[PDB]
């Protein structure tokens, strides 16, 4: 009675089945005769339908199968900070190798509708668009989608970088990406000083299929350690539709019957259960969380695709990138009209949502009648005030890359922008105008900044009036 | 005998083998108990659903939670009765999973309680009303513009943040506190945070108290979010027989049910329907429905959200349930910034009911009033915010003016909005607010401000209000 | 002069406003052969698929 | 036996339903819309025969009037096209003008008795 | 019915009109039955042997040096959809066309055929 | 061809073009031949393995410490239709985009690249 040991029959494109294995549970961990690792998905009366987690072309018909009797797990512990790993768990930076004293099976229950409780604190991202009007707080799950080449990488990085004073702890999941995009995003996190206290997990496209149908699943196994553990924790991956399609490349090998678009019938599932344990938990816990940002990219701005679909029914709002807007210049290229946060409004500090609003409107009115302003016919009083108010505040909301703005002097420029004091500045001097009142705050605005870091709270405003006015009386005009 | 062993396992669809001559029969359960016997195993407790026979003394089931660390020949335990869950007042104030056990922290249900099958044949055709009743709920855009029927399915359009929460709560106050009627909410594929948060706030407002609670996950397999909608309802049949009271059932998307069970069909492997979706989503969408009727002894009322995929109102899964729906609210973002509640529209908002066999001669012709004078109003606002009144002629005028009176009459305070504000709330019957609809219509109070008719409900409490600030 | 300028007026209000309704109505028969296409090229994609894969 | 009768069909499209849901089931390939090509003939065989016989045969007759739901009044459906190809004639109701009240639009303009004509009375053809 | 006609061609030598009725339920019934048969479908369902079918039938309807048949067949699209497999199969049979219009007849000409829309080869 | 490159690339250690004139032929042959092969159908009728042999291809184009490969991939997709999955597979792994303008080439400059639609990471 062969009952760990077994032997291929049919081999090819990862897949493999193996005949015996009769004591094998379903999604346990199974090594080939050469060392490649496998995972055993089918059980079938007779075969075991396997999945190679590598090089597959040197396993041949006729070779040894053997057990190990471990569902599957990754290495997680303290040592993975600052390391680039595959979701196996393996180094692929050189660098020596880990000392991960424990591990922890990748499917776990999520915490369950008991142990939770209602977010309540803010995740600064330090981009001013997103963190005035779409704000995001700990243990929420936002999706940001967009086209290609609209600088959803660049927005990811700036948050992570953003981090860096808090408690916060970031992961970045790499899902197909180039592995020269891999390279320069860890050389710049580097060089911003980040790589003290984030882990990235990387699958290339040259990866078999399993290992990118893994990466997410292993990230958020490797997050949930320190969410047991106490802290808070940001994870953030780039492609859940190519980790769809890996998934359905899988499938349809191993012969499960299709459904719409060729995708197996449990591809909800998957990102539901993969989305689901991100969470904020309840104080009898210790009070952890962990905030989601998943990327979905969509061909010509198409979100009636299934996969964005799924998506957008399981998270918590969405932000928008117009690649319209991108050409244009305007970075980050905002799209605010069609962007939602549900959670949002609890997720702001009160010296920010004092001012939100006003802001907010003033953008929706503008964003209507922005065809007015071909022609100077509008009535004055009040249509060209709102083409001109609209004009400076988004003026005031375009940023550079990798510069996060701390969130006093975000709401310091927001609050002089929405009481009308910028009316008088030319729109096309806003930015050097915004510069110099930062440097000027850094001068001698220190008491309003120290207040409102201590305090979530408005400065006084008489004295915020009065430093404004001294700023504007000190600017030149050019 | 009882006893059966594993033989096939493909992600959430499970096979199994029985001896020959005592296979179950369709839609019972099957409960899987093990321990570890050594290191290389997981203890595993798990409970399946018999689907189809496949011939050779095999059956192929589906599974209510993970799959993971199953084993070809594993004893798999047959039940001989479908999914069985505890039924009486116990359920009250309890929150449970698909199978009927509680998730939260009160405790565990004795085992010696009344339990029902889940799956259950449709009431006969004898037992049905025979006549239309009207529900009275006491909220006045209801009960004036869209009447609930007694046994009926009323749609519920809106997204988040307009309130929809508050509107749940107060109509399930309301109902219990004016038809001694117990309520049931059931979550079919709700989003986690949100439940928890809908929880807390129902117990803080402590409606909670008269309440039964169905909770089925977005990370459960498709078994348990088609079957959660069907334990929720089984919940409500006990109250509706054996109780003979009026019953409230919520569900909080259906349009999930209905892809749940497209998934499920998938996996079984039919071949799909018209637009991917299962070949019996007809005959299931019956065989749910079907069983929220109004017999001669109690009554179900059925309250559902409905989310239209890609806003399309021809889509497959929207007209089905479309196919049964007796009456429609929607509520609309713009009525939610104005200081006006519970934010309904009063145009888009249709229903059945609205017919003078029904509500009568005298209701019909003031709900037709004021549709048409708000309709008219609605017409004359987009000239008016540019020419200014003073184009309007005086009939305009005096149009306009009864049209803002009778829209801020629309609103309502609420007995759940008491831990914010200090109002009491009010409960106002069908007669009076017709009456004072009526009255109003005819001009006898077009001399008080408007502001007298934001949040009073009845029509005396204007008068009172508008002689309080004299 | 003056009753001409007004009537020139008076002429693109009520030319604008067709045209505005014009364009509305032409928007809703849009969308329907909109969503009929959809629905069309996925239920004939969806049958392909399942035909293909049960030929085998 | 030579008597006049009526019958009303209720939904022949959640009949068609039934029968492409059982044909899907049978493992049939669809057509057009997952319908299976069977379904002009399920509907023609159902609706042939009404007929007035001779008077010869007993001088009987079988009138129906089946009902067809549709989407957003849209007659390009297949099952609409199905039904109108096979019957005599259609009577179309307007929803828009449902809202006020009015017993739904006899709309002229699609409406259509191509055997009719013969059978009103000369007091009302005039 | 062609069977019947081709009779009178080939031996009466005389010229026949023979009329089909509506040449669409012809594979459409060919459709219905290729599934029973077991052959895989085509585009939209159809049976496979469509063209070749359609070949068989027409190109019998022929002129021949003692005698000739002609044909007038009447058309039917589904869903008024002239892209569809059979429409297109058999539009490339025909040789002419010709069209009646309510409107000359109501207005009270009675060959009621248009005369802008009727082409010819 | 890409083997011929990498010769040059790792003994030499010098910067080398390549020039493919036609990826889309080179999935189409994938999906043509993973039919016979035998394995299911996939979206559009492509292989399931569409995206890992492409990135298998495309992954060995890269830049190392002591060589260089820069490759210029012709892409010209029929119908015009840029949501096709082996277009948006491919549009993945590009670095630039440059547009060829028969309007700048008749007003008649070279090489009449055009300015506006070409972009760059």
Redesign the interface.
């Known amino acids: 009675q062969v009952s760990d040991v077994g032997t291929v029959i049919q081999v090819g494109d990862g897949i493999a089945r193996a005949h015996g294995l009769d004591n094998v549970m379903s999604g346990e961990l199974v090594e080939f005769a050469n060392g490649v690792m496998g995972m055993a998905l089918n059980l079938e009366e007779n075969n075991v339908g396997i999945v190679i987690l590598g090089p597959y072309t040197g396993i041949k018909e006729g070779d040894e199968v053997r057990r190990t009797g471990r569902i599957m797990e990754v290495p997680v512990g303290e040592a993975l900070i600052g390391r680039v790993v595959n979701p196996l768990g393996q180094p692929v930076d050189g660098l020596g190798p880990v000392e991960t004293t424990e591990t922890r099976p990748i499917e776990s229950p999520a915490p369950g509708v008991m142990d939770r409780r209602s977010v309540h604190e803010p995740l600064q991202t330090g981009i001013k668009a997103i963190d005035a009007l779409v704000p995001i707080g700990r243990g929420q799950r936002e999706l940001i989608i967009g086209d290609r080449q609209t600088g959803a990488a660049s927005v990811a990085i700036d948050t992570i970088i953003n981090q860096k004073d808090q408690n916060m702890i970031s992961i970045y999941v790499a899902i197909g990406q180039k592995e020269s995009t891999v390279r320069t995003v860890v050389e710049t996190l580097r060089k911003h000083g980040a790589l003290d206290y984030t882990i990235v997990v990387t699958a290339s496209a040259s990866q078999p299929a399993p290992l990118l149908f893994l990466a997410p699943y292993a990230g958020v196994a490797m997050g949930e350690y320190f969410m047991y553990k106490g802290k808070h924790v940001l994870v953030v991956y780039a492609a859940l539709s190519k980790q769809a399609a890996a998934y359905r490349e899988l499938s349809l090998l191993l012969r499960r019957?299709?459904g719409?678009?060729?995708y197996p019938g449990d591809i909800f599932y998957l990102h539901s259960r993969l989305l689901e344990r991100a969470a904020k938990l309840s104080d009898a816990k210790g009070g952890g969380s962990l905030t989601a940002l998943p990327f979905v990219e969509t061909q010509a701005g198409d979100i009636?695709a299934y996969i964005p679909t799924n998506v957008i029914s399981i998270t918590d709002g969405q932000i928008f990138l117009q690649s319209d807007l991108f050409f244009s210049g305007v970075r980050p290229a905002i799209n605010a009209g069609l962007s939602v946060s549900r959670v949002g409004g609890a997720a702001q500090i009160k010296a920010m949502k004092k001012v939100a609003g006003t802001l907010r409107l003033d953008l929706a009115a503008y964003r209507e009648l922005e065809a007015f302003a071909q022609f100077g016919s509008d009535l004055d009083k009040a249509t060209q005030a709102k083409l001109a108010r609209g004009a400076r505040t988004v003026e005031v909301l375009k940023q550079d890359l990798h510069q996060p703005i701390p969130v006093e002097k975000q709401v310091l420029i927001i609050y002089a922008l929405t009481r009308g004091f910028l009316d008088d500045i030319p729109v096309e001097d806003v930015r050097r105008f915004e510069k110099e009142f930062y440097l000027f705050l850094d001068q001698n605005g220190q008491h309003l900044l120290e207040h409102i870091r201590t305090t979530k709270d408005l400065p006084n405003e008489d004295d915020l009036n009065k430093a404004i006015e001294a700023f504007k009386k000190t600017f030149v005009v050019s | 005998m009882t006893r059966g062993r594993v033989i096939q396992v493909m992600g959430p669809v499970v096979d199994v083998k029985f001896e020959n001559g005592h296979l179950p029969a369709i839609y019972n359960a099957l409960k899987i108990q093990h321990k570890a016997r050594n290191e290389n195993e997981v203890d595993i407790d798990l409970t399946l659903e018999v689907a189809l026979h496949l011939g050779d003394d095999t059956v192929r089931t589906i599974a209510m939670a993970s799959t993971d660390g199953l084993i070809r020949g594993m004893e798999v335990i047959d039940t001989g009765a479908p999914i069985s869950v505890p039924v009486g007042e116990v359920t009250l104030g309890r929150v449970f999973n698909v199978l009927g056990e509680p998730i939260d922290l009160e405790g565990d249900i004795p085992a010696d309680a009344r339990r029902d099958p889940i799956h259950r044949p449709a009431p006969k055709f004898e037992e049905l009303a025979t006549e239309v009743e009207i529900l009275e709920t006491g909220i006045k855009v209801v009960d004036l513009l869209a009447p609930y029927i007694k046994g009926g399915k009323i749609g519920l359009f809106g997204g988040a943040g307009v309130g929809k929460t508050v509107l749940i709560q107060e109509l399930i106050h309301n109902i219990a506190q004016e038809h001694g009627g117990i309520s049931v909410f059931a979550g079919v594929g709700e989003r986690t945070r949100e439940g928890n948060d809908l929880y807390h706030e129902m117990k803080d407002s402590g409606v909670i108290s008269k309440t039964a609670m169905v909770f089925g996950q977005m990370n459960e397999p498709p078994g348990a979010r088609m079957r959660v909608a069907l334990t929720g309802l089984t919940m409500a049949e006990y109250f509706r027989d054996e109780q003979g009271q009026d019953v409230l059932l919520f569900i909080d998307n259906i349009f999930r049910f209905t892809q749940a069970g497209s998934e499920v069909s998938a996996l079984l492997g039919r071949?799909?329907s018209?637009?991917?979706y299962q070949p019996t989503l007809a005959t299931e969408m019956g065989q749910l429905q079907e069983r929220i009727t109004s017999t001669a002894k109690g009554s179900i009322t059925s309250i559902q959200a409905i989310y239209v995929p890609a806003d399309?109102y021809?889509?497959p899964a929207p007209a089905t349930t479309f196919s049964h729906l007796d009456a429609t609210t929607n509520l609309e973002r713009k009525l939610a910034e104005m200081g006006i509640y519970p934010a309904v529209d009063p145009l888009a908002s249709t229903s059945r009911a609205l017919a003078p066999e029904i509500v009568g001669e005298e209701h019909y012709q003031v709900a037709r009033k004021v549709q048409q004078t708000l309709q008219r109003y609605k017409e004359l606002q987009d000239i008016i915010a540019i020419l200014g009144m003073d184009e309007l002629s005086d009939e305009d005028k005096l149009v306009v003016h009864r049209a803002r009176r009778i829209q801020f009459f629309l609103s309502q305070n609420f007995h759940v909005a008491e831990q914010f504000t200090g109002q009491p709330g009010s409960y106002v019957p069908v007669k009076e607010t017709v009456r004072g609809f009526k009255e109003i219509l005819e001009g006898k109070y077009d001399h008080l401000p408007e502001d007298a008719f934001r949040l009073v409900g009845r029509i005396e409490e204007v008068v009172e209000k508008a002689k309080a600030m004299g | 002069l003056l009753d001409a300028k007004a009537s020139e007026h008076a002429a693109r209000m009520t030319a604008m406003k067709n045209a505005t309704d014009n364009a509305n109505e032409l928007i809703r028969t849009l969308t329907?052969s909109y969503?009929?296409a959809?629905?069309?090229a996925?239920?004939?994609?969806?049958?392909?698929?399942?035909?293909?894969?049960?030929?085998?």
């Open positions: 019957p299709p719409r678009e060729a009636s | 071949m799909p018209a637009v991917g399309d021809t889509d | 329907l969503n009929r959809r629905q069309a996925i239920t004939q994609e969806i049958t392909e698929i399942v035909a293909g894969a049960n030929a085998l």
